[PDB]
Structure formats: structure tokens, C-alpha cells
Design an enzyme around this catalytic site. Structure first.
Site, PDB file in Angstrom:
ATOM      1  N   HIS A   1       0.835  -1.182   0.000  1.00 18.43           N
ATOM      2  CA  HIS A   1       0.000   0.000   0.000  1.00 18.43           C
ATOM      3  C   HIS A   1       0.886   1.255   0.000  1.00 18.43           C
ATOM      4  O   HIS A   1       1.930   1.299   0.671  1.00 18.43           O
ATOM      5  CB  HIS A   1      -0.919  -0.080   1.213  1.00 18.43           C
ATOM      6  CG  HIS A   1      -1.984   0.951   1.251  1.00 18.43           C
ATOM      7  ND1 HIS A   1      -2.776   1.241   0.166  1.00 18.43           N
ATOM      8  CD2 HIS A   1      -2.415   1.747   2.261  1.00 18.43           C
ATOM      9  CE1 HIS A   1      -3.638   2.189   0.498  1.00 18.43           C
ATOM     10  NE2 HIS A   1      -3.444   2.511   1.763  1.00 18.43           N
TER      11      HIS A   1
ATOM     12  N   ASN B   1      -3.743   8.764   4.279  1.00 25.86           N
ATOM     13  CA  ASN B   1      -4.266   7.583   3.617  1.00 25.86           C
ATOM     14  C   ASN B   1      -5.360   7.979   2.622  1.00 25.86           C
ATOM     15  O   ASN B   1      -5.948   9.069   2.682  1.00 25.86           O
ATOM     16  CB  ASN B   1      -4.818   6.601   4.656  1.00 25.86           C
ATOM     17  CG  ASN B   1      -4.842   5.148   4.163  1.00 25.86           C
ATOM     18  OD1 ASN B   1      -4.506   4.845   3.025  1.00 25.86           O
ATOM     19  ND2 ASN B   1      -5.246   4.255   5.030  1.00 25.86           N
TER      20      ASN B   1
END
Length: 384
Positions: free
Chosen positions: A318, A343
């Protein structure tokens, strides 16, 4: 019209407030204390969220029954027993809370595939948090939600170029992530279920020379995989006048066309230097790209306010952005330092989309939570 947008959101807030009242007697209620009026309000809450959610969370995975929803919400309240009433009413809007298995939420919400003046008041070598400055360009780059595709390589890459543009005087205009998802050369790929890397982002810039604004071609996860669009005549090109640079290979960095990358493992016994590189680039470019391992680490209940003490495992799946940093004295009296991390899981996750993690991590860690960082080496001209 924009009306029913606000009617449905009102009904959701109402539903959330009813539930919170019934979840406490304040001490939380045990699961057997769950009467049928809660069970109906829970189910109706999730029935709302489903008809309205744009992230694909509930399109794709099994909805819990009333007791699953109850446990999901109970765990969120426990993990956030300090948050004000409003910070908690906020997390209830993550549709993940209606999942039979909340772990489903991130299965396909990753996306890294490894290849091979007054600004100084808010961001300086000691402390950096541009979000405390509601006038900062970078602070008007609102958090986004990649939906149910593995496109974090796009979101973290494009954010990094958005903060670079902010540092050069441009307005905080969002790049179209969908253009990057659907416009590429080579063999066809499953752009929703297979991720990539900031290297490809740079390659797509070279090959297409165009980055439309979000409003020209706006993102929704179900549109990932549709055909690359014709650029229309009114579209803004946020890569106007940009050039891709290329610096010399240095001995402890990976350099290529348009990027420098640094791996934490290469700085294992010299982490102050690693920290210093990131701070310098966060100050100069507004952010760096960071590679992390999300799987089995972070979820819907993850605390964004507490400084997390996490180990890495020498892999990453990620891409996120380090956007700031600071020092705290922990409960045990020790002075410690944290990264502030953005994020792409929307604003109902973490602390309005962000979290904090100790730079150095606990002492037993063999690998740092930050697997790598990546900086773009590009040129754009200052905005007048």
C-alpha cells in the site's frame, strides 16, 4: 438534485444518533442487552449506508446481521472511548461497519506492487503540520477515498505531485486519478484488482503528457477499467510545462527517471539520516510517498490520534504519503517522534483520513513500518 443528497445524509446522522443513545446505559451495553428496537435501527442504518455509499464497500461484500453490526460498532466505540461525541459520530459513516467481516474492507483497497514564508511557522525542521493552517494550499487538498480498487499507487503518487504544485504557487487542484487508472500503454491490465507503483505514474506522464483536473474526469471505483477518454477542449492540464528530471545514482538511494527512492532497511543502523531525508523532502515538496504493509495491520477501527508503535515486515502492499512530523513525550516520560501520514481510505478512517506512527518504532522491530519512501524529481515553473 443536491437536495436528496442532503436528505439522505440527514437521515444517516439521525440514525447514527439514535444508535449511540441505545448503545449506552455511561457504560456500553452487553450484547444480550440488545433489544429489538436497536436491532431494527442497526439494520435500517446499514440499509441506508448501502443505498448511498459510493465506495463499493457494501456492493461487494456480505452485510452483517444485527449482531455483527452491533459488535462492529461496539469495537469502534471501545477503540475510541476518548473521542468526543462528534469524532465517534464520524467513524459510524464508514460503511465498513455494516460488513459481516470488516476485514473485507481492505482486501481490495490497497494497490502497491513493488517492481524489479509563513509556511515555516507550520513546517520546519522541528515540527511540521500544515493541516493546522486552514489557509495553506496543502490543507485544502481534501482527503479522498480510492473505493474498492487497488489504486493507492495513483492516489499517493498524485497527492505528492499536488503538494509539489502547491509549493510552486499553484492552486490546490486535484489530479484526475481515473485518467491515470484508465490511460496507459502496454498490455491490458485489470486496473481495479492489480496495483502498481509511482514508477508507472511517471511513465504515464511521459507517455500521455496530460493530467486532467478531477472535475474534468472524476473518480469512482466502478469506472476503473473503462476506456481511456478523449481529452476535451476545456480540460485543464496539471502537467503543463512539467519536465521529468534524472539525478545521479547515489550509493544508498535508488534513482531513476523522475524519482529517488530510499529503503528503510538500507538505513537500519542509521535511521537519523533516513528521518532527515524525509523531513527535508516533506518541507521542500510538501510530502513524500511512503510504502507500507497494510494487510492485517490497519482497519476500520484503527486509531488516528494515538501515536502508533508499529513494526514493518520487510514487504509493502500500500502507498500512502508522509505529510508532517512532530515530537511527543509519551506516558512513560520518553521523548519520541512521529510521522503524520495521509491515507486514501476517505475521511471516516483514522483522524479525518490521517494517522500518526512512531518514526523509529519499538525496539524489538527488525524492520521499520515505513518500508520505503519515494520523491518525484520533476520540474514545473513557479506560478508567476
Amino acid at each position: 438534485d443536491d437536495d436528496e443528497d442532503d436528505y439522505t445524509e440527514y437521515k444517516l446522522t439521525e440514525s447514527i444518533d439514535n444508535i449511540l443513545v441505545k448503545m449506552f446505559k455511561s457504560e456500553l451495553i452487553k450484547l444480550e442487552e440488545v433489544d429489538d428496537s436497536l436491532k431494527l435501527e442497526l439494520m435500517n442504518y446499514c440499509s441506508l449506508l448501502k443505498d448511498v455509499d459510493t465506495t463499493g464497500t457494501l456492493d461487494n461484500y456480505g452485510m452483517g446481521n444485527e449482531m455483527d453490526i452491533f459488535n462492529n460498532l461496539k469495537r469502534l466505540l471501545i477503540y475510541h472511548s476518548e473521542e468526543n461525541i462528534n469524532t465517534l459520530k464520524n467513524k459510524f459513516r464508514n460503511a465498513a461497519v455494516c460488513l459481516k467481516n470488516v476485514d473485507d474492507w481492505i482486501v481490495n483497497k490497497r494497490g502497491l506492487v513493488l517492481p524489479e514564508n509563513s509556511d515555516n511557522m507550520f513546517c520546519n525542521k522541528e515540527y511540521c503540520n500544515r493541516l493546522k493552517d486552514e489557509n495553506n494550499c496543502i490543507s485544502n487538498l481534501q482527503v479522498e477515498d480510492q473505493g474498492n480498487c487497488d489504486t493507492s499507487w495513483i492516489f499517493a503518487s498524485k497527492y505528492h505531485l499536488e503538494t509539489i504544485r502547491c509549493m510552486k504557487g499553484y492552486e490546490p487542484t486535484k489530479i484526475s486519478a481515473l485518467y491515470v487508472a484508465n490511460c496507459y500503454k502496454g498490455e491490458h491490465k485489470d486496473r481495479c484488482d492489480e496495483g502498481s507503483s509511482p514508477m508507472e505514474f511517471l511513465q504515464i506522464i511521459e507517455d500521455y503528457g496530460f493530467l486532467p483536473a478531477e472535475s474534468n474526469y472524476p473518480y469512482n471505483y466502478v469506472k476503473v477499467g473503462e476506456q481511456c477518454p478523449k481529452v476535451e477542449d476545456h480540460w485543464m492540464n496539471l502537467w503543463d510545462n512539467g519536465k521529468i528530471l534524472h539525478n545521479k545514482n547515489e550509493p544508498n538511494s535508488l534513482d531513476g527517471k523522475g524519482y529517488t527512492a530510499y529503503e528503510s532497511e538500507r538505513f537500519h543502523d542509521n535511521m537519523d539520516a533516513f528521518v532527515k531525508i524525509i523531513k527535508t523532502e516533506v518541507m521542500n515538496k510538501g510530502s513524500v510517498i511512503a510504502y507500507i504493509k497494510a494487510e492485517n495491520v490497519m482497519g476500520y477501527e484503527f486509531s488516528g490520534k494515538k501515536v502508533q508503535n508499529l513494526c514493518g515486515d520487510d514487504t509493502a502492499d500500500h502507498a500512502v504519503n508522509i505529510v508532517g512530523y512532530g515530537n511527543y513525550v509519551n506516558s512513560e516520560g520518553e521523548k519520541k517522534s512521529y510521522w503524520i501520514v495521509r491515507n486514501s481510505w476517505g475521511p471516516y478512517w483514522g483522524d479525518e483520513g490521517y494517522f500518526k506512527v512512531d518514526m523509529y518504532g519499538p525496539t524489538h522491530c527488525h524492520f521499520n513500518f515505513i518500508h520505503s519512501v519515494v520523491i518525484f524529481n520533476v520540474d514545473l515553473p513557479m506560478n508567476n
